[PDB]
Design a binder for this molecule. Structure first.
Ligand code: GG2
Length: 112
Protein backbone atom coordinates (compact mmCIF):
# COMPACT_ATOMS: atom_id res chain seq x y z
CA UNK A 1 0.00 0.00 0.00
CA UNK A 2 2.72 2.43 1.00
CA UNK A 3 5.17 1.13 -1.59
CA UNK A 4 2.34 0.72 -4.11
CA UNK A 5 1.17 4.34 -4.08
CA UNK A 6 4.73 5.68 -4.05
CA UNK A 7 5.46 3.51 -7.09
CA UNK A 8 2.24 4.80 -8.66
CA UNK A 9 3.27 8.43 -8.12
CA UNK A 10 6.55 7.55 -9.85
CA UNK A 11 4.70 6.13 -12.87
CA UNK A 12 2.48 9.17 -13.35
CA UNK A 13 5.55 11.33 -12.81
CA UNK A 14 7.19 9.29 -15.58
CA UNK A 15 4.27 9.93 -17.95
CA UNK A 16 4.74 13.70 -17.67
CA UNK A 17 8.51 13.25 -17.96
CA UNK A 18 8.12 11.28 -21.20
CA UNK A 19 5.69 13.72 -22.81
CA UNK A 20 7.88 16.72 -21.95
CA UNK A 21 11.01 14.81 -23.08
CA UNK A 22 12.58 15.58 -19.69
CA UNK A 23 15.25 12.96 -20.39
CA UNK A 24 17.39 14.29 -17.54
CA UNK A 25 14.44 14.02 -15.16
CA UNK A 26 13.81 10.47 -16.37
CA UNK A 27 17.45 9.44 -15.94
CA UNK A 28 17.46 10.73 -12.35
CA UNK A 29 14.85 8.04 -11.56
CA UNK A 30 17.28 5.27 -12.61
CA UNK A 31 20.12 3.41 -10.99
CA UNK A 32 23.47 4.02 -12.68
CA UNK A 33 23.76 0.44 -14.00
CA UNK A 34 20.07 -0.04 -14.78
CA UNK A 35 18.92 -1.62 -18.06
CA UNK A 36 16.46 -0.12 -20.55
CA UNK A 37 15.07 -3.13 -22.43
CA UNK A 38 13.83 -1.52 -25.65
CA UNK A 39 11.83 -4.22 -27.46
CA UNK A 40 14.06 -7.10 -26.41
CA UNK A 41 17.21 -4.99 -26.83
CA UNK A 42 18.84 -4.18 -23.45
CA UNK A 43 20.68 -0.92 -22.79
CA UNK A 44 22.69 -1.14 -19.56
CA UNK A 45 24.10 2.00 -17.97
CA UNK A 46 22.93 5.61 -17.87
CA UNK A 47 25.04 6.44 -20.94
CA UNK A 48 23.17 3.98 -23.16
CA UNK A 49 19.83 4.93 -21.57
CA UNK A 50 20.17 8.65 -22.31
CA UNK A 51 20.65 7.72 -25.97
CA UNK A 52 17.49 5.61 -25.90
CA UNK A 53 15.67 8.62 -24.44
CA UNK A 54 16.91 10.97 -27.17
CA UNK A 55 16.25 8.56 -30.08
CA UNK A 56 12.65 7.98 -28.97
CA UNK A 57 9.93 9.27 -31.32
CA UNK A 58 8.04 12.48 -30.57
CA UNK A 59 5.21 10.58 -28.91
CA UNK A 60 2.34 11.38 -26.57
CA UNK A 61 1.66 8.72 -23.93
CA UNK A 62 -1.46 8.00 -21.87
CA UNK A 63 -1.56 5.39 -19.11
CA UNK A 64 -4.58 3.10 -19.33
CA UNK A 65 -3.77 0.44 -16.69
CA UNK A 66 -1.27 -0.09 -13.85
CA UNK A 67 -0.29 -3.52 -12.48
CA UNK A 68 1.89 -3.43 -9.35
CA UNK A 69 3.52 -6.59 -7.99
CA UNK A 70 5.57 -6.93 -4.79
CA UNK A 71 8.32 -9.53 -5.21
CA UNK A 72 10.03 -8.65 -1.93
CA UNK A 73 12.45 -5.73 -1.83
CA UNK A 74 11.56 -5.06 -5.49
CA UNK A 75 8.33 -3.74 -7.01
CA UNK A 76 7.54 -4.94 -10.54
CA UNK A 77 5.14 -2.54 -12.26
CA UNK A 78 3.27 -3.35 -15.47
CA UNK A 79 1.72 -0.34 -17.21
CA UNK A 80 -0.48 -0.30 -20.30
CA UNK A 81 0.19 2.85 -22.32
CA UNK A 82 -1.56 4.48 -25.27
CA UNK A 83 1.33 5.73 -27.42
CA UNK A 84 0.31 8.42 -29.92
CA UNK A 85 2.98 9.15 -32.50
CA UNK A 86 3.99 12.35 -34.30
CA UNK A 87 1.44 11.70 -37.08
CA UNK A 88 -1.54 10.62 -34.98
CA UNK A 89 -1.09 6.83 -35.03
CA UNK A 90 -2.11 5.48 -31.62
CA UNK A 91 -0.41 2.25 -30.57
CA UNK A 92 -0.89 0.10 -27.48
CA UNK A 93 2.48 -0.35 -25.78
CA UNK A 94 3.58 -1.88 -22.48
CA UNK A 95 6.33 -1.22 -19.96
CA UNK A 96 7.72 -3.46 -17.22
CA UNK A 97 9.45 -1.22 -14.67
CA UNK A 98 11.27 -2.72 -11.68
CA UNK A 99 12.07 -0.66 -8.59
CA UNK A 100 14.44 -1.59 -5.78
CA UNK A 101 14.04 -0.99 -2.04
CA UNK A 102 14.98 2.70 -2.43
CA UNK A 103 12.39 3.22 -5.22
CA UNK A 104 15.04 3.44 -7.95
CA UNK A 105 14.51 2.01 -11.42
CA UNK A 106 16.71 -1.04 -12.02
CA UNK A 107 15.02 -2.42 -15.15
CA UNK A 108 12.73 -0.75 -17.70
CA UNK A 109 11.35 -3.03 -20.41
CA UNK A 110 9.24 -1.56 -23.20
CA UNK A 111 7.60 -4.03 -25.57
CA UNK A 112 5.83 -3.10 -28.79
C1 GG2 B 1 2.93 5.61 -31.61
O1 GG2 B 1 3.53 4.35 -31.64
C2 GG2 B 1 4.77 4.28 -31.00
C3 GG2 B 1 5.59 3.19 -31.23
C4 GG2 B 1 6.83 3.12 -30.61
C5 GG2 B 1 7.23 4.13 -29.75
N1 GG2 B 1 8.52 4.05 -29.11
N2 GG2 B 1 9.60 3.97 -29.78
C6 GG2 B 1 10.57 3.92 -28.91
C7 GG2 B 1 12.05 3.83 -29.28
N3 GG2 B 1 12.43 3.40 -30.62
O2 GG2 B 1 12.88 4.10 -28.48
C8 GG2 B 1 10.10 3.96 -27.48
C9 GG2 B 1 8.71 4.05 -27.75
C10 GG2 B 1 7.84 4.11 -26.54
O3 GG2 B 1 6.47 3.86 -26.66
N4 GG2 B 1 8.45 4.42 -25.24
C11 GG2 B 1 7.64 4.56 -24.04
C12 GG2 B 1 6.67 3.62 -23.71
C13 GG2 B 1 5.92 3.78 -22.55
C14 GG2 B 1 6.14 4.88 -21.74
N5 GG2 B 1 5.36 5.06 -20.54
C15 GG2 B 1 4.26 6.01 -20.52
C16 GG2 B 1 4.13 6.71 -19.17
C17 GG2 B 1 4.42 5.93 -17.89
C18 GG2 B 1 4.86 4.48 -18.09
C19 GG2 B 1 5.68 4.29 -19.36
O4 GG2 B 1 6.58 3.52 -19.39
C20 GG2 B 1 7.10 5.81 -22.07
C21 GG2 B 1 7.85 5.65 -23.22
C22 GG2 B 1 9.91 4.75 -25.15
C23 GG2 B 1 10.80 3.94 -26.15
C24 GG2 B 1 6.41 5.22 -29.53
C25 GG2 B 1 5.18 5.30 -30.15
Amino acid sequence: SARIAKAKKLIYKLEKLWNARDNDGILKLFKDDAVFNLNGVPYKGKEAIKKVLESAPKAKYKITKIDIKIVGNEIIVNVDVLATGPSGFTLKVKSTITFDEDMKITSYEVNL
